[PDB]
């Protein structure tokens, strides 16, 4: 019934079948889910569904640290229809039938950030007395960062739908149940949907890295 | 349900029946999947499906190392339709029926790189302190390179489709299930789809080669 | 399902019923499958299907070695239709029906190379330190060359088609299966399709020849 | 399914019922199947079908050796239709039905060569160090030559057709099989189709002759 993970998963699929690319849940702090930003701990309830927290990490601007593709377009339509109905030995005619047609008018822009600039970032002196040490140590999420800025300049348009129909009969008792809920969302221009993973380890003074998509969280920081 | 491996496999087929030519999964870092670039380790789950990592290898430009066909066209249509349906002794009418018509408007360009220039490349002094040694030794993918630049200048057009229909009956219970999902992708002009294999072995100081399509990975580097 | 061997086999048939003339698989390095070029080792899986590798052999240009018919036309159509269907004692109605109509607009040009020039080529001093000795000795394909340049100046037009229809029934279970895939390829002007065989033996210093169509590979070089 | 032997056999029939006159398989080196040229060894598989090799024999031009009818026309049509069908005790209805209508627009020209000039040719001093002695002795085909130049100045037009229809039934199993393949070839102007036989014996220094149509190959040269 969520829609906002779905569009990010079309982006994910356009990358790989549930592989490298990562998705976000919502877009108040997703526009601020740019580089140098965190994620929450991961649980496996109702599929892949993790937590999220989006504070900042910039500390110093002594040396050169903040110096600065074409439009990519997705007019796609994805259809998912399915009816599962089963009758029980208690003459219960359990039923369900859903259908959803999603229209995506996804627009994507790109802001290039250098890959060796990541190493330049570890070359930065990590020191900040912002009130995040206590909660960061309490959580120990071993936060990761993003590789490159994947920006959007979109119109306000996504659509969705589902249906459901359930019947039952326990003791000559009729039961019919129907529902048709169609949804759609106004999607705003300049927001962030999909991001990457690059592990960072934080000794209390200076940090170090761990390269490839380490979302299996274990660290003694 | 992937589409981006398919078009690369039309290129592969236009080379050989699943033989020499090699395919890529996606095209954010495929435009940067030019020469001097890596691939991930290979597994055999769900057919031939490997990993990918696309960092760079250029180290020195002391001597002449960076000095610099017509349009090739594919207006093809490939059709794949199939219905597999089987009934079980439990009166289950298991069903499935899919169909996909793919329209490819593939455009290809060529940027010539000399073959003896490969030997000139091994004649280069291999020395770089970029942070890749630790992860490269951890992975030991015995990376390979590409032979010649296979470039594209394309329009934004590929199409695809599938369908599915499944029924069932366990205890006088009706179940009907249908789905029709048609997809299409906007393909951008200047990207890389298919590449080649040429094995390189890396002693810590100076490297050496291994010629023909060694994708069977074993090396003690 | 390959098309590119087929057109070369129309050329082969216009020579002889699967006899002297030889075919190639694809045309990125087929334009560079001119004289002085190699082929891969031969296996007999799925009919006559060999490997291919297309590096160069020119070493010296001390003496006269690089000094330099009308258009031949094929507007043909070849039809191949066939239905094989068999019913099993398990009431399985195994079926298959294919059809393909191929339209060839083949254009051919000729660049004359002297036949005694072959002997002049063995009179050349064979000496080259290009990195091919190691892999050539590892392979031992006892490479052959081509007799005369068979060039093309073509338009972009070949067509093809196939169909298939399979049914089955194991335990009162219906199964119907159909597929219609029509293909066509844009054929480019100046490429090479068919070539010849002339055996060469390579002692490490100077080479020698072996005349007629020795594709049965055995040599102790 | 060959067409190029057929037209030569219309020429042969216009000479005699499979008698004196001889036919060729194809026409890349048939234009160079002029006088002083060879043929391959003969085998009796699938009717009269021999091998072919077309190198040259001219050695000297010291004395007069290279000093130099109307158009003959064949607008004919030959029809060949036939259905052979047989039913087996295994209720197999083996079938076959073919038909072919061939339209020949054959054009023929004549270049006169003197018959006593043949004796003048044996009067020539036979001496040539071209690399053909080794392979000629290895083959021992006791090559023959041609009597008179039978040239053509043709348009590009021959046609052909065949059909086939096969049915079967082994165990109440239906099988129907049909095919309709019509072919046609663009025939080029100045080529050679039919030639003659005159035996030559080659002692290592000087040669000798053997007159009439000795295609029964035996010689100790």
Numbering used by the authors:
A (entry chain K), B (entry chain L), C (entry chain M), D (entry chain N): 2 to 69, 81 to 233
From the paper:
Although GSDMB isoforms 1, 4 and 6 formed pores similar in size and shape, those of isoform 1 showed less aggregation than those of isoforms 4 and 6, and isoform 1 pores were seen to be distributed evenly on cryo-EM grids. We thus subjected GSDMB isoform 1 to cryo-EM analysis. The GSDMB pore was found to be 24–26-fold symmetric. 3D refinement of the 24-fold symmetric pore led to a final map at 4.96 Å overall resolution whereas focus refinement improved local resolution of the globular domain to 4.48 Å, allowing us to build an atomic model of the GSDMB pore using the structure of GSDMB in the complex of GSDMB/IpaH7.8 as a starting model. The 24-fold GSDMB pore has an estimated inner diameter of 150 Å, outer diameter of 250 Å and height of 60 Å, very similar to the 27-fold GSDMA3 pore but much smaller than the 31-fold GSDMD pore. Similar to that in GSDMA3 and GSDMD, each GSDMB pore subunit comprises a globular domain (‘palm’) and two inserted β-hairpins (‘fingers’) generated from residues in extension domains 1 and 2 (ED1 and ED2, respectively) in the full-length auto-inhibited GSDMB. GSDMB pore oligomerization is mediated by both the inserted β-strands in the transmembrane region and the cytosolic globular domains. The interaction in the transmembrane region is contributed by residues running along the neighbouring β3 and β8 strands between the subunits. The interaction in the adjacent globular domains contains mostly residues from helix α3 of one subunit interacting with the region around α2 and β11 of its neighbouring subunit; and the α1 helix from one subunit juxtaposing end-on with the α1 helix from the next subunit through hydrogen-bonding and hydrophobic interactions. The cryo-EM structure of the GSDMB pore illustrates a unique interdomain linker-regulated mechanism of pore oligomerization and lipid binding.
Gasdermins (GSDMs) are pore-forming proteins that play critical roles in host defence through pyroptosis. Gasdermin (GSDM) proteins consist of an N-terminal pore-forming domain (GSDM-N), a C-terminal autoinhibitory domain (GSDM-C) and an interdomain linker. Recently, GSDMB was shown to exhibit direct bactericidal activity through its pore-forming activity. Shigella, an intracellular, human-adapted enteropathogen, evades this GSDMB-mediated host defence by secreting IpaH7.8, a virulence effector that triggers ubiquitination-dependent proteasomal degradation of GSDMB4.
